[PDB]
Amino acid sequence: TTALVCDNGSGLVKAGFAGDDAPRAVFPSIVGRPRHQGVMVGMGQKDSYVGDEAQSKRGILTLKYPIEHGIITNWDDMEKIWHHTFYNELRVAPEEHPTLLTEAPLNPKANREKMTQIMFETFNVPAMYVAIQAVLSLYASGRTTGIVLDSGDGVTHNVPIYEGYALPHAIMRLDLAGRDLTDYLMKILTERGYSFVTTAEREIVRDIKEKLCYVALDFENEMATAASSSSLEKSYELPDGQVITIGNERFRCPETLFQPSFIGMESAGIHETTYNSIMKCDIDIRKDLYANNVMSGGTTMYPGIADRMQKEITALAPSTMKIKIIAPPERKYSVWIGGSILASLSTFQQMWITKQEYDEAGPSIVHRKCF
Template sequence: MPFISKIQRQSDFNLFSSHTPLVIDNGASYFRIGWAGESEPRVVFRNIVQRPRHKVTGESVTIVGDHDPALMKYFDCTRSGPRSAFDNNVVYQFETMEYILDFGFDRMGATANGSEIDHPVLITECVCNPVQSRSKMAELLFETYGVPSIAFGVDVVFSYKYNQQQGVCAKDGLALCPGFTTTHVLPFVDGEPVYKGCCRTNIGGFHVTDYLKQLLSLKYPYHMARFTWEKVEDLKMEHCYIAADYLSEAQLFQKGAKEAEEKTRYWQIPWVPPPTEEPPSEEEIARKAAMKEKHIQRLREMAEAKKSSKINELENELHGLEILLHQLDQVEESDVPSFLAETGYVSRQEIESARNKVTQSLRKAKGEPKNEQAEIEKADLTANEKYSLINIPDDVLTPEQLNEKKKQLSLKYMAEGRQRLKQRRYEEELERERKQQLEEEKRLENPELYLEQLHARYRDLSEKVDQNKRLKTNGGHTNGNNVPGGVGRGERLNAAQRERMRLLTTAAFDRGKGDDTFGARDEDWELYKLMSKDYNDDDEEPDEDEAELARISSRLQDLDPTFVPKLEGDSSQSAEVPRFRPLTKEDFHIVLGVERFRCPEILFNPNWIRIDQAGLDEMAGVSIKRLQYKDEKLEERLTSSILVTGGSSLFPGIIERLEAGIRMIRPCGAPIKIVRALDPVMDAWRGAASFACAPQFHSQTFSRQDYYEKGEDWLRNYQLQYTL
């Protein structure tokens, strides 16, 4: 698909002579292209490429530079972020660079069908650009676009020469260029750059913006989606500044001084207050109550109908079973098996058992009270019938009957155990209800005293449970050297596990001599049942103290709204349970305080973001020392004309901070004069456009014929002469 852009296409491309050069300022942040001799570039856009997919068709779209945010809702950008052709101010992705050049030449008005660009091209590059990058750029321009000749120039030098023509700086001086991804310091002697004195660090405006984005995202994590790169870039350019003394500036904000309040800036994110719900009227409350009562009545009717239907079914089933028993009484003994086979039952006992179950279900459905005594007597009768061989002596029983007696004995023990467990649970439930009733009476008599006693009980139990957990984990004794720890597994067992170990030890000691006759006696089955219980440590039931602690904690949460239970594993401090809080207007109030001067400070202290390199003020001293000239007057002339250019030089306070930093590394009384470029962003292109319109410019170019004859290696020694 074609490019998407809001930049208007130029219409006078064919009106310019083929001798008029095209000037390109190929910066890491912005791409600027225009005609030589003009004061402003024709086309300016961000030097990035993005290739999202259309959400409907799935077709890829190439977006170069700026784009309309209203159109991006139709594209999926999750798999394709913005890509740059630069790596630390050096072009290395020439496929991306081709997209950018295509777009730039198209916006200048070059014909899309004819790929020939019959104009000389002056393109900027970074200081000491690698010959590999320069040769690939020449190959791209010559082979793809058919450019007749090319000239490569350094953007910092063009900016310095342009400001020299305007009388801002002298022939001898220093150019400090904090750019987008790198910072360069380049000395000038007699108007020409001295590259052996160049100094560079990988820090620039990109890192400042990224650092500010990180700080705001950490400070306001619920607004991370709003901190887009473009918005943070605007906040940086609008509000950030460089402090003359960072420590003093930070202390102002730490103390909360009045000057700090004056330097604080605010950004109000659009906030819409949540709609306030008006309390319902009396008519609405009455209407909802009537509807609720109507719904409850309908549920009651449905429950009654369901209950009546179930009772009718049970009565019909009971009546059928009674008829079946009556018919069975009238059947002769020889015809009973055939009669039972037709009914589907095996014996008379099975029919009576089914009748008893239906009778109990019918009583339960009708809500009739249980006859406990009758059930007990019936259970005894059933037990006597079921365990008929238990009371018969062994000497009168056959071997088959002895085996059956053992089975009945085992089943009887298990049934009695279940009955005892059921009775114990019933008694515990009655006791629990009695205690709850007593506690409720105490609470009603004196609520404050009851709540205080409940808190004290909770603290005591909490300390006891924590101590038990520590003893269970680490043990409760020393290992003989007054050093805690070294506890055996037996000392970490609970009471039930210790009892099982005792039973196992006793049984092993008693049965260790002679033949193993365990299980021959009836008493051995009781011991077997005690030892065979599941005492898995992982599924161990909670201790009584823990259960009581949980009950008191639940009770306190119901009675005391300020009560906060202790977190598990933290016995010393009570942590408040995080609760959801709706965002208010203050949460949409972005405060820019220390961040205003903390982010640009990395230009002078790159180690704050883990870049172990020199700061901007130190680089000036390093660059002067690299010249290795023994002329002290030359050093004075260099420091007397220091030009600051580049996008990151627009921070307020950078001139004063640089002067203070350079004065600390220069001799006392040395002249220091630092000035900012007339337009730090556009002066590089303006200087290149002024240089390209000179008559001697064509002698400084590298033609396509030279490229075919001499090859790319000739570019290794290519160097532009800036003084024409």
């Protein structure tokens, strides 16, 4: 047989066999339900919807979003998502393969324990594993040392990994991920005041985050251009309906990552988090990590992040020592890609959990057996 990996890093959900270059297809992990009396009696009423099916149907559906802050909120919804993805896309039966799970690090045990409980009981499945994002990110990016930032839909990460080892004290964990940012977007956008709030309406913003955003190189100077120029301003349609046209309000959004006042918290932001978290970690290693610096997924998609990142580290580092960052093409897939590699090597045959243990000891097994 063969080995299969689900990404449930939140946002669109990624699933594919070991050794394909990229997953077969991808699903938002929206779940949605009817909102209105069903009034074509000719219609079959189906009461739950997921995936691009929902993505089409949205307007009368309303969304629940089944992962808050990387912790999966409500199990039966997950079960819908998970079940659907296997049967409908994959045409795969749960006995058929090991299945591999992708986890926010350093977050509450419950997601581990129930995830395994469900998947061994509800599905009955040869082998289970839970793996921390950064590890996969390294394997795919193929530099045994590094530090990773990958800020998905959900909770946003720094882990230095040195070659072959963890520094779990080192790690920093932040709720700044693109979802919350997007919901901040609206509180900007009503300034121009083309304005809409409902769940589907909030996802409409996601498209604008695709098209119209780019990262501030320097905030003041950009504002000066804002006074000077309209190239900062671009014209964009509703997905259907109007043309909409957006000022600094585009570029201002990502700045939240650098200055998280605008939806306000204090943790002094990505870059200062990074340099903080290094200076936590020990003295000799540091040069390598200064060399090997790696980024992936949801936030990184924005054009320009790497430049201001370099500006920030060159601010905080003693300039004397090398700095660079990696911005691979494939970042949005990266995690699952690394997972594919992780699945491939025979050593996991040594490493998987098997059903037998789940028979002979509880969910407790996981928390010893995996990281």
